[PDB]
């Protein structure tokens, strides 16, 4: 198979605040749906709570050391089990949050990263990643507009 991480980062690699995403960027949410639809998505229990409902058209796999509390999604207790629950698929999408990104980054072949030109009070950060290990294979910058209040750049990195 192949493991990919997808995330949106504000300044200083901030990805969250008090278990929430403090911004609204509809173009980035559309990019997220386009790149995760019809794929399995792995997330940690905190991120499941922040989303609050299953993502439709995706197999939702939740990592937690505690028993599952919702039969609409798949609960797993380890990284190995999470990967196995995905089945034989071309690409597995890991959708955070911080503690989960840390664990899957050494396994990942691709990073789908949105860089948001926004300064945000945050407590959760994307993991420190060594830039030499990665090559940029796609980059697309967008200015702010009437629907998206900050400029942003989509990037796909591939492990060298
Ligand atoms: N901007 C973005 O792209 C983005 C993406 C995702 C999330 N976020 C933000 O990230 C923040 C949450 O990230 P987080 O780091 O606090 O928590 P998280 O990584 O979402 O989930 C952490 C929890 O997942 C479970 N877990 C993780 N690894 C496990 C393992 N190997 N085995 C078993 N259980 C495991 C544990 O749950 P138990 O305690 O139940 O064992 C752990 O407490 C929120 O602010 C969210 O909004 C942002
Ligand atoms: N690039 C990126 N941006 C994000 O905002 C993001 N968020 C998470 C975790 N949080 C969330 C929060 C909401 C939705 C969500 O509502 N998505 C719906 C609607 C998409 C839309 O409205 O365009 C979905 O169907 O994917 C997804 C993930 C993980 N990876 C990300 N990756």
Residue numbers in the entry: 0 to 159
Article excerpt on this structure:
Dihydrofolate reductase (DHFR) is a key enzyme that is essential for the synthesis of purines, thymidylic acids and some amino acids. DHFR catalyzes the reduction of 7,8-dihydrofolate to 5,6,7,8-tetrahydrofolate using NADPH as a cofactor and plays an influential role in folate (FOL) management in many species. The M20 loop of ecDHFR can adopt three conformations (open, closed and occluded). We determined the structure of ecDHFR in complex with FOL and NADP+ under pressures varying between 0.1 and 800 MPa.
In the M20-closed crystal, the M20 loop was confirmed to be in the closed conformation from 0.1 to 400 MPa; NADP+ and FOL were also in their proper positions. The volume of the M20-closed crystal was 32 520 Å3 at atmospheric pressure and was reduced to 31 440 Å3 at 800 MPa. For the M20-closed crystal, the numbers of water molecules assigned were 87, 135, 134, 108 and 41 at 0.1, 220, 400, 650 and 800 MPa, respectively.
